[PDB]
Symmetry: D2
Subunit: 447 residues, 4 copies
């Protein structure tokens, strides 16, 4: 069987790996239009901050190692079109310009997403950067040590926007994060968390300008100013981390796409075309908290989807098990983690939830290593099934979100978690741990 896998990032890569597991027999071709195989953009901050020194080590596969296992790797080769009917694909070697047709028995694509750019005045002024991929990573590292960069403006206060802000602030630049949303990191955390995070960032030379629409970039040749409807800010460098758009324009009319460009697929990763499967940022995923499907552009999700596509290559036998949307990140001294439904997700979904937040030391008061911890447990009003949770502390308590991810999937209730067995040892936690305590507060609130 000849299987073509498009993309060398998380969705494409785990598909190649699963093909080696379940189909060592097959002729596998792996296509990547860029010059570098499997760069991990998730590690870009570790690199920019100087924890990881070599940009080229921030990966998880070389093309050269995949060829050693019998995979035909074509870097700098773009798949330009699909002819599903004919079971052919058009590919173009970007080094030589030479186009060719390639045949397949099964095709798995993981096209990913492209950074959304603000189509406003001054869009083509120099030093308005993006943050995705190796090329942007090295350019951004050039700018961290550039003595001509003093003020950095990052547009977008999400995950990437805050990583960019932290890296440039730590590097010694004055940063302003600008967004129309009124809370940084609202997709991940609720207000009692984002207010502490805002305060923490402000203590580190970051202004966070919420509720502002960017209107135009000003400057002679290069940016010099970012102008919003409420204010104007000096900028020597801009980092645009506002959103992502599915890389699917080329597929319009070949495959069925949702109005926003995401490829329509079922729980077996099959597209509208037989033998064409799609995964990753460009697709929707089964979201277990609300038994629905949403778009969650995370590496974890792309990875599992890539494997499940190979699992269903010849017949629909393994339905995808669903995800809870879990995240975790450190923002200066704080480490947070989140899974399931929080305010922003509940509003997008139109789901009424109930919740309790416990903010107290996570160790018993006699232990001087005690530190304050925030934990919010979100649950269903009717069934009291666990729908989400968020936690934060200067202590690293993030691995607890893994327990909540399973509780949601398992449809456990607040009474289940209130009395759930979690170990106790006073150097690590309180008699009723962080999850137990929140759940007991939730049953108290439902008396």
């Amino acid at each position: 069987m000849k299987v073509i896998v498009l993309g060398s990032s998380h969705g494409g890569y785990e598909a190649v790996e699963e093909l080696l597991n379940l189909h060592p027999d097959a002729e596998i071709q792996w296509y990547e239009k860029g010059d570098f195989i499997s760069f991990l953009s998730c590690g870009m901050q570790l690199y920019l901050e100087g924890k990881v020194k070599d940009v080229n080590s921030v990966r998880y596969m070389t093309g050269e190692k995949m060829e050693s296992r019998g995979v035909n790797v074509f870097s700098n080769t773009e798949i330009t079109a699909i002819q599903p009917k004919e079971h052919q694909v058009t590919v173009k070697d970007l080094v030589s310009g030479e186009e060719r047709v390639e045949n397949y028995d099964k095709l798995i694509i993981s096209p990913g997403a492209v950074p959304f750019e603000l189509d406003i005045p001054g869009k083509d002024l120099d030093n308005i950067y993006l943050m995705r991929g190796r090329q942007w990573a090295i350019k951004l590292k050039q700018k961290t040590v550039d003595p001509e960069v003093n003020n950095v403006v990052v547009i977008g206060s999400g995950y990437i926007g805050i990583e960019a802000a932290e890296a440039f602030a730590k590097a010694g630049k004055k940063v302003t994060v600008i967004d129309i949303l009124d809370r940084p990191l609202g997709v991940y955390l609720d207000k009692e968390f984002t207010d502490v995070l805002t305060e923490e960032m402000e203590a580190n030379n970051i202004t966070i300008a919420t509720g502002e629409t960017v209107e135009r970039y000003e400057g002679d040749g290069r940016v010099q100013k970012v102008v919003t409807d409420k204010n104007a800010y000096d900028a020597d460098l801009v980092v645009v981390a506002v959103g992502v758009r599915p890389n699917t324009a080329w597929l319009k009319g070949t495959l069925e796409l949702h109005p926003n460009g995401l490829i329509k697929t079922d729980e077996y990763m099959r597209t509208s075309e037989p033998d064409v499967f799609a995964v990753g940022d460009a697709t929707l995923i089964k979201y277990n908290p609300a038994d629905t499907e949403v778009n969650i552009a995370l590496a974890t999700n792309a990875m599992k989807q890539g494997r499940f596509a190979v699992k269903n290559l010849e017949e629909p036998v393994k339905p995808f098990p669903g995800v809870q949307g879990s995240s975790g990140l450190a923002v200066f001294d704080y480490k947070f983690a989140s899974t399931g439904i929080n305010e922003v997700m509940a509003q997008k979904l139109g789901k009424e939830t109930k919740a309790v937040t416990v903010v107290e030391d996570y160790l018993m008061d006699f232990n001087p290593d005690k530190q304050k911890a925030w934990f919010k447990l979100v649950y269903d009003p009717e069934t009291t099934q666990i729908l989400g949770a968020q936690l934060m502390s200067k202590a690293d308590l993030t691995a607890n979100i893994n327990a909540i991810s399973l509780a949601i999937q398992a449809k456990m209730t607040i009474e289940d978690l209130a009395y759930a067995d979690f170990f106790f040892q006073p150097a690590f936690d309180k008699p009723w741990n962080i999850i137990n305590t929140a759940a007991l507060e939730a049953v108290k609130q439902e008396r």
Copy 2:
């Protein structure tokens, strides 16, 4: 209603708390034979090691604060007998010697356990100590700084035995842990883990003498030598942490007891006598990994049982949800956590299990903060349902065991966990985290 609660430790205390939640109306009497209310023996190591300076802060309730909420606290008062038929109890004020009878409508007891003592020659030689309670804690702290103590022998290589060994080694004493069992901490961890832990402890002046039966203590007036069948060891202080025995002798014939002294109770915490409930170390608990019941002397378990007894005070409506036996502890630079069935538990239960162990860095290789992590996933041969897990690292990854505790309870399989949604961010974990990786190895092993 007049409710009498015996014991001011974890089982007794959470019962008083739950009575305040669900029965603020009742006359509550709380009895404790010792002079101190709610001392936390779980924090004794933090104290001995000098992280917590005041022995009296290692608690979670004062008698004086409970009386402020209308509970009648009787410290230094021992319940000597129960007359269930009459719904009376015999109590004795140990300060005054004056016995009296007390009436009740419901009685909840949490008698706990007593350290098992080796009935061998030299048993009454001075400086053979135990490690449970406030009185022993202050005596053991006296010995950590005693210049006449050089060699310390701790008998019992379990949880308490190793805490005692670490505290005395850190304090500067030569320690030898002695046990007939061939592995330290075998109740919690399997051999690939306990070999690393043995090596770590040996690097810290601790000899671990496994496979040896202690025969006699030698010394003139005070210990001077501990003699086993394979060897003899100098000892200035001995700490006996070999086991626990249910504090139920006084109840024989009043309540039905299992052959080892544990009080027979059902899933609603009711004893063989109507209106008498029992919880904690002295009882068995529903153990969800193998849908059975076992004795697991842990604070977590006592706490939840104490609350469930009050929940079922007037009628059996809340069946206990079960526990997985979870633990966690740091042993010098390593932190481990464990839940469910491991080798020792499988042998006690006679259950055949299958398992995989993954030992590799928990962060991707390009990140210099990467450290080695051990994770073993135990599962059912037939169903591949998750039955247990153990993990260890110098990095603190223990909160992940909370996810596994729920996976076992939920009867999740290795395929469920292989593709379970766990967040990825390269400062915190690898694309497929520690649980995902072990579960993928387990499906690989079942191909």
Copy 3:
């Protein structure tokens, strides 16, 4: 020649060492009335604080190692009298009670000093301790971890008093230092320094009660209260570190003594009796800052004097070179060092001095590791010769006081030090280092 050396501490010990250097031929007898050879009381704080665990390692010679080099060590043997005329000494073996006479050709004694005790009401109440020697060190360590000790009162705010206060405060006790003097550590530092040190100690649970005379100790059997003329303080333990008295009572009439008990000696360490030499705390020493002689009870001084006595054993050929009184100590986060004349010494001596104090970061402002440093340079009004200096910082800059000690001895001026060659490297200091800057300020002040 038979040389008898009295005392196994700093003066006695360096004399034995120098006898081995210059007289390997001689029969040497080394006497010590205590049970332990060469304990270092200078290391008692490191021990009490738990940095050094074994009390017996805080030494610099064993009796057993000295006998290996042919010295006859008599521990537990007290020299009770000297008959200089006859060249005999009376010694008593304290184990056996048996007195004997011993002959000598030369005798070198280093009797040291005894802690001064306040002869007031309640002087014989239990738990009023002292801080000198091994026996007191182990007793004080017993008290650091005693749960019955809550309030500790140390009387005397000098070097020892503050070590005692820091050790007990760090151990978790409430401390009050009491003294009639109005400044802690005034013998070492001037007010701009002791005010910062007072503030630092107060931030660590230490009250410093200056200007108060202790009148009586109160308590039933054991101390319970310390009463001064201005106030009364609860005390579970008292540490008396107010002064020292020469251990010379037994010598009155045998050797000429100054009115305060110090043995009269010349610059060659000879007493009023031929062939009897005396050194250490019990003598005066040449003090080069003011070309006078003062009593400075420091180990450094005893050590050098011990060697110089052997140097002048047969004839006065090596006049003692003099000392500057140098000290250094850390008090919580601060490290200070001092040499020469400061306010208190100038008042005792009646010497008019001039001085400048510079308080600024010790590194150039662009270097974020910069920290504030205090340096005071004291000089002669007329000649501008360097008479003393004091420095302090949370950075350890103490070794600079060694340069000043030599500058005073050499009779260097403020102009000499202003332009003295001290290296510059911006990770270590400013272009004009801490000494240069103070000296330039002193010439500025003499314009």
Copy 4:
């Protein structure tokens, strides 16, 4: 009086400061040919290593702050010639090209030195850098984070060469230091020290190629290889830190110069021309260790000379007091300091010296914070006067070299230092400190 000061670095700057002290009356003109006033090249490593983030903060004066005190600052203006006879100077505004003549009553010049460049094949290949000044500092920082730089070769194993090597190694590059000299840092330290330092650097990805003459640079357009007589090395960047040459070519025939270009001056900083004074790297300085004069290109020396020139502006009244050549630097975990004559200096001077080296823990053995320290004391064979010393440890003991600098100046002997008063406190040092111990070993060696 109109005083012209040439150069805004250490010699020029301290002259302007001293003019403000002693001559606030005068018209002062301060000339600097570069665009930046008072950059501190001594702080370039702190900057390259990322401890100091802003290149522009690494200074000690702004032109703008000096004008505020009435000094006429002319940056970007080069003094092209001196007409001493006429008391005029030719200056050229490098921005406008306009030359002019300026008059003076007194002229003080601090021209400094220029990096020596190897006139070999390939000298004009791109990426062969130097390390002096702001412009080179920012270029070198560009290269630390450049992903195309892998191998860095620094030619010259002196102070600057090793700073450059450490900065690039810490930044993640493979470094090779190349020099004809057989020991790195030989001008500062002797072999027992430089062998430990070599080993330390090799443990950090630095090859140190001693005894090799560089013959040619190879590469197409940019360096690619450095070829020596014994070997060839790949190089993406070269840093040339081999020497300095006096910036005096323009003065030949105006002022008398030594054969190597240094300006001839007396102990009052006067040149061969009346009213023209010269200081800094371009001059010789009185070197007190051997009562001679040598060229020591250090900031300390330039600073003091700058002030002494103003002190002797109207008449020779303040003879320069001399320097000892003191240095100090950290090289990875080690901190060393040095003053006076060591092997290399003794060979240049032709002076026979004697020396002892003590290598042992600097704290008493019972204190676990003890660390190994190296100290070498160099002295005169005949008089035993202190001629130099070197010390090194992972503990920072460098401030002790300040004591030795004064001992040499004062002509103290090994017997003086053996019994010199240095404080003792066991958290800081041994009874006989690091200087005392070395000096006692030196008297032992002269028995």
